[PDB]
């Protein structure tokens, strides 16, 4: 087709390459691990407290807290990977640095739950870069309110995963999320919306080309962008509850930066 199309194809490919470089465990590998369609060693399954201790070998006082703390190391690395990815989005590093911060601050969580779905099925979630598989029931079973953290992310994941997106689709979708002009406290919305308009066009063409039999995939996917915001708000409230009722725990400083005055 035309040279306008062609620029949008080139953007899609640029984002896809950069996605591949930024994120070690892609949805492609993750699904191979989960279906069994890779033929190398399976993940160690963690379904109860006993399996958790036994698995402490192959993944890196009270268990809920131990899982909480390990989840922080992973989040912090996710934020790092997402930041590197954002910096590859054409036009992003030319924005006001304060606006770059605001976009990441609000966007990283929504991207994290988007990409966590790649790691999930209805029964559990790959952890520790595909080496562990932690069951959904086990996570529900954890003592309140820790058993509340993951279940909404599973419910989201099961519906989101039905769209059958691949990495090349997700690369553009996540760039769309980051370049949201309606984040609180943005100084200069116009250059952000100019980039997002382009990304959205690129997303729409990608979905028509890559899923030509699947009409209104573009519209279904845009509606999930609001589901992601609900997950985030509910997640931050649970985090507030924990911060009050588990006085002893400490939150990693990167995560403090992000969650602050977003509570």
């Amino acid at each position: 087709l035309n040279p306008e199309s062609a620029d949008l194809r080139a953007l899609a490919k640029h984002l896809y390459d950069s996605y591949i470089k930024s994120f070690p465990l892609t949805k492609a590998k993750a699904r191979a691990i989960l279906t069994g369609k890779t033929t190398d060693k399976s993940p160690f399954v963690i379904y109860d407290m006993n399996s958790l201790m036994m698995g402490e070998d192959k993944i890196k006082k009270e268990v809920a807290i131990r899982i909480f703390q390990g989840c922080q190391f992973r989040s912090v690395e996710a934020v790092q990977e997402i930041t590197e990815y954002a910096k590859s989005i054409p036009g992003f590093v030319n924005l006001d640095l304060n606006d770059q911060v605001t976009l990441l601050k609000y966007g990283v969580h929504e991207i994290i739950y988007t990409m966590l779905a790649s790691l999930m099925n209805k029964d559990g979630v790959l952890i520790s870069e595909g080496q562990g598989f932690m069951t959904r029931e086990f996570l529900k079973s954890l003592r309140k309110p820790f058993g509340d953290f993951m279940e909404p992310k599973f419910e989201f994941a099961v519906k989101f995963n039905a769209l059958e997106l691949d990495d090349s689709d997700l690369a553009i979708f996540i760039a769309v999320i980051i370049l949201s002009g309606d984040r609180p406290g943005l100084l200069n919305v116009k250059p952000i919306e100019d980039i997002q308009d382009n990304l959205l066009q690129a997303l729409e063409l990608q979905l028509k080309l890559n899923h030509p039999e699947s009409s209104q995939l573009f519209a279904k996917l845009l509606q999930k962008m609001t589901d992601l915001r609900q997950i985030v708000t509910e997640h931050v409230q649970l985090l507030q509850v924990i911060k009050k009722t588990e006085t002893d725990m400490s939150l990693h400083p990167l995560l403090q930066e992000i969650y602050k005055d977003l509570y």
Partner: peptide
């Protein structure tokens, strides 16, 4: 005031 994010972004 987002000192880590500032550092990650300028890196």
């Amino acid at each position: 005031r987002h000192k880590i994010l500032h550092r990650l972004l300028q890196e």
